Amino acid sequence: TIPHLAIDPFSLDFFDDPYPDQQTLRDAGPVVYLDKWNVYGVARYAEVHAVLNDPTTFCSSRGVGLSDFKKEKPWRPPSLILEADPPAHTRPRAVLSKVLSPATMKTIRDGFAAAADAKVDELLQRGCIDAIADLAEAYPLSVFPDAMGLKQEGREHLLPYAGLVFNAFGPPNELRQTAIERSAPHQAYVNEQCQRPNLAPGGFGACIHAFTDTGEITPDEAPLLVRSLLSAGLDTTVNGIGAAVYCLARFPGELQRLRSDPTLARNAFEEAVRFESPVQTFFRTTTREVELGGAVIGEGEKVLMFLGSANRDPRRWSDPDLYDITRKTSGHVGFGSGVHMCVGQLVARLEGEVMLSALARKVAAIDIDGPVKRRFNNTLRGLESLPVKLTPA
Ligand code: HEM
Ligand SMILES: Cc1cccc(C(=O)O)c1
C-alpha cells in the first residue's frame, strides 16, 4: 500500500542537491516509508500541513528528531516547548510569545535596523566579502546575543552549540555522532548563561526569568526556556539571511525589484524562507493508529515531515522553484504551522527585513565571485561560504 524508498534524506549527496529526491518523495505517494531509517515520510504540502496541525495524533513529546524518547534517552533534557505537547506545552509557549512579542519588537527595531545599515556600509567599504561569515553570521551575532542579554565572553560557543542541536535531530550518522562528541564545552557554556544572574537587564533572557511569578512557569523552568532561545534563535536566522542573500545573488531581477521598492524587504525575506527552507525537516511520533493520505500508520511510529519539499510542492505553489519577492507566501511551512509554529518568527522577520532593507537602499549589485561551499547539517540547509562582490548604489 505504501511505497518503500531507499533515499537517505540525511546523506551528504541529498544535502548537496535535495530537489530531485524531494520530487521523487512527493510523487511516490502521499505517505512513503523510508527503509534507510524505518520512518514514515510525508513530502507533499497537504500531508505536511495535516500532520503539523494534528498535535494529538502526531505528538512532539517523544522527540522531533529521529530518536523516540520513549525508547532512548534524549541527548539533553527535553525542551519545555519544542518537545512538549498540550497541555504542558501551553503555558511555556505563552510566556515565550509575550517575551518575543510586538512590544518587544518595538523596543529593539531601531537598534536592529541601525546595526543592519552599519554592517552593509562596512561591507561596501571592503567590496569583496563572504556573505556567510561577514554578513549572514556577522549581523545576527551583532544583535541577537546582545538582545538576549549575554555577556561578551564565550559567544564563540553559540553557533557550535546550535549546529550541534540541529545535527542531533538527525539519525545517528557521522554528522550527529561527531557533533555530540564535541558537545561538552558548548553545553557547559550555554547551560551556564541560562541562569538568571548571567542575563543582562531588559534582554530576552531576563524577561523569561521575570515571567516566573505569574503562574505560567516556575523559576526552575526559566533556564530551559532561555536555552530554547539560545538553541533556535541564532543559527536559524544565519541561514535565513544567508538564504535571502543567496537568492538575491542568483536572481538579479529580484534584487532590482527590491531596490525599486524597499518596502518589499519583509516579503522578500519571507519568500527566501519558503524557497530555501533553512529548517528542512522535523519529526513527529504517532500516538495511535491513524489514516493519513489513504495510508494506515500504526501507533508509536516516527513521521518525517519535509518542510522544504512542502514549500516547493507544485500541488500547492505556482512556479515553486522561482524566487518571487511579490509571491503570496502565506501558508508556507518554513516556520511550521499550528501550535508549535515558530514562536521567534517576529525576531526572525525583523532581522531579515531590516537587513534586506539595508541591501535594497545601499547595494546596486550582488555578484558571486568565488567558489560557493555548502554547509552540511542534519536539519539546517545553508552555505558555509558565499563569496560576493557588492557594488554600491
Ligand atoms: C529564519 C529563522 C527561523 C526559522 C526558519 C525557524 C523555523 C522554525 C520551525 C519550522 C519551528 C516549528 C518546530 C516544530 O513544529 O516542531 C520553529 C519553532 C520554534 N522556533 Fe523558530 N525558526 C526561526 C527563527 C527562530 C528564532 C529567531 C527564535 C528565537 C528567538 C526561534 C525559536 C523557536 C522556538 C522556541 C520554537 C518552538 C516553538 C514551539 O514548540 O511552540 N526560532 N522554528
Ligand atoms: C525550533 C527549535 C530548534 C532547536 C531547539 C529548540 C528548543 O526549544 O530548544 C527549538
Ligand SMILES: [Cl-]
Ligand atoms: Cl545543552
